[PDB]
Amino acid sequence: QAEWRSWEVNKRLEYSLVKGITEFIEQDTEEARQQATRPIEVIEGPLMDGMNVVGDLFGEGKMFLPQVVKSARVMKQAVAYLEPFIEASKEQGKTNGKMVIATVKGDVHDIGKNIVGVVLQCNNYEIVDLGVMVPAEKILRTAKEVNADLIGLSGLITPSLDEMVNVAKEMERQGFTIPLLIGGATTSKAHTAVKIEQNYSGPTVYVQNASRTVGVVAALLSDTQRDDFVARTRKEYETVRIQHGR
Amino acid sequence: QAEWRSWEVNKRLEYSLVKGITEFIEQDTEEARQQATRPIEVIEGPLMDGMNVVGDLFGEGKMFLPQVVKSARVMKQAVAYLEPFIEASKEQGKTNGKMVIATVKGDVHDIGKNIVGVVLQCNNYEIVDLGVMVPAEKILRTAKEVNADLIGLSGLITPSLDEMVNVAKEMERQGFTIPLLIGGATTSKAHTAVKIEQNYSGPTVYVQNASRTVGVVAALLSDTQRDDFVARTRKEYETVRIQHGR
Ligand code: COB
Ligand code: COB
């Protein structure tokens, strides 16, 4: 075995990602699977780190698109393997809610819009994923028609941030009332507080990652928790504008 | 059911911090130590989570200062217990660099300025911690006298942010060139890129936490990694301003 093939499973995952090696992903993911308490952990641990580095190497031009593209296929393959180990974890239960999630317009990144989808799914919620590059009006038309309890927007490229600010305003125009969930690698609480929220009277909660989304969605949907959380949050967003020199 | 004294060690930790109980902190921390790969994990895991809760309760007026102060005593007691286990963890052989770290003016929070210090130390770096509430002038004077290869500012309250921006400016005035590291609970990369960096020609890198500081200090000091890392960083902060409507 090549020396790399002897490193720590976690260090082997990262390598595979970077290099775009699809030959050992499954057997590596599985080994990593058995060590973690929860499948989601391998995804948000090793796998994500691996994608981070890929991100960087690409950013410093030490990596190119055709390569990040091979790295994505490996990530994709790794997630795919875990997916049933996730869905086996959801006994009984019906539905706690429903969310129309979608990668904003101009953006084709979805690897994450998906992990959050698969997670909320095995948590008993219905996720109508509109896909990548979906237009604001098609976001709302579906949110209405399906009667979603929330809407999640994913965004990874700079311009996306604006499409988010935009569907926030558009939602308000149609006088929506459902909590807006924002996320995606290039999304920060700062921007969500500073540039997104203000454009909408309903809750707009920036959530950092998939596993933490379940926590918000429950709150946003709990008759007890709702009003408090939404305030705590609104007040937290009030502070950050203060700091950024409003 | 019964008393806290039967819960998960991690769950017993979080409690002790909230209530300010110092009777089982060492005994408990030890149990937590034997489960983590590295001591730093408990400090950045349970302990931090407890202190987060504490902050919150204080913020919601559900907890008062004389209580957050006792919680501090416990957190402090837990770290202390851990320190030698950290020191007995690594010593390599000699100094890699030198850093003057200090908690900004009018700020007295320091439980983190220290953890980052104790981490950096066992990794073979010399740290001259100027303490809390240190004025810009004294930071620079020491930075020069001691010929530090970096400077670290810790800040946990809103006003501190401004002092950070201030010492960035002041460093530029004395035409410094060492990299400036920003950190602290109320420190964000957004504010770091939007309001701090611009004021200084040398590197201004915001590090999320102590453990991750090692990985930056190393780059900042590597002949190889240096110019790239510093460029990737700068460019990253360039984008964040752009999203922030700048
Ligand atoms: C698991 C997932 C891993 N993350 C990743 O999957 C993305 C990785 C990576 C390396 C980017 C680096 C990076 N910084 O991550 C880089 N890409 Co891409 C090179 N890219 C690709 C890949 C996408 C494939 C796919 N279908 O995903 C492509 C090769 C096609 C690709 C394409 C582009 N990419 C481009 C760019 C430059 C970038 N790419 C990035 C996003 C990045 C950040 C890299 C960089 N640094 O330069 C660039 C964006 C910079 C910017 N600020 O604009 C670009 C423009 C390149 C090009 N063609 O030249 C092009 C854009 C296409 C477009 N029209 O939009 C990839 C793979 C990447 O994490 P995540 O953060 O997305 O999800 C995470 C998760 C945790 O589970 O759930 C969360 N979440 C996310 N969505 C939601 C939520 C949470 C809630 C509550 C929601 C409601 C929604 C939370 O965010
Ligand atoms: C380990 C450490 C845990 N975090 C903690 O130790 C802080 C906990 C807590 C509960 C705060 C809540 C919170 N959100 O955390 C709250 N404090 Co205190 C109530 N407090 C105290 C405690 C501090 C004692 C001490 N010596 O530490 C005191 C009771 C004395 C205290 C005092 C104040 N506090 C006050 C306030 C309101 C707050 N306090 C906060 C900080 C906070 C955030 C909570 C809140 N929410 O209200 C308030 C500030 C909000 C704001 N935006 O201004 C205040 C004003 C209360 C008063 N007296 O009325 C007062 C300030 C007095 C002053 N002159 O500064 C405490 C304990 C807290 O994590 P950390 O993030 O600091 O370190 C972490 C670590 C990871 O390893 O390394 C990183 N790092 C940090 N520094 C650096 C780096 C990394 C690098 C690269 C660097 C160069 C530097 C990274 O940040």
Tab-separated table of C-alpha atoms in Angstrom, chain B residues 2 7 9 36 42 62 82-83 108 110 132 135 146 151 158 164 183 190 198 221 223 231 237-238 244:
chain	number	residue	atom	x	y	z
B	2	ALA	CA	-31.813	12.738	41.485
B	7	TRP	CA	-25.168	12.881	34.813
B	9	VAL	CA	-19.407	14.006	32.900
B	36	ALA	CA	-10.609	13.441	24.979
B	42	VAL	CA	-12.205	19.632	26.965
B	62	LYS	CA	-31.393	35.361	34.409
B	82	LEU	CA	-5.461	20.912	32.801
B	83	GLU	CA	-2.357	23.052	32.200
B	108	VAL	CA	-10.580	42.762	31.791
B	110	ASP	CA	-8.734	37.067	30.068
B	132	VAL	CA	-5.484	42.868	30.801
B	135	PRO	CA	-2.708	50.539	26.414
B	146	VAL	CA	11.115	42.143	23.004
B	151	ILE	CA	1.145	40.531	18.405
B	158	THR	CA	-17.957	45.818	22.268
B	164	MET	CA	-8.177	46.876	18.354
B	183	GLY	CA	-9.332	37.229	18.730
B	190	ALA	CA	-16.362	40.326	9.311
B	198	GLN	CA	-7.584	48.341	6.315
B	221	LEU	CA	6.129	32.405	10.279
B	223	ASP	CA	9.142	31.190	4.641
B	231	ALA	CA	-2.429	36.761	0.403
B	237	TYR	CA	-11.156	39.865	3.718
B	238	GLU	CA	-11.468	41.754	0.435
B	244	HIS	CA	-20.972	43.841	3.361
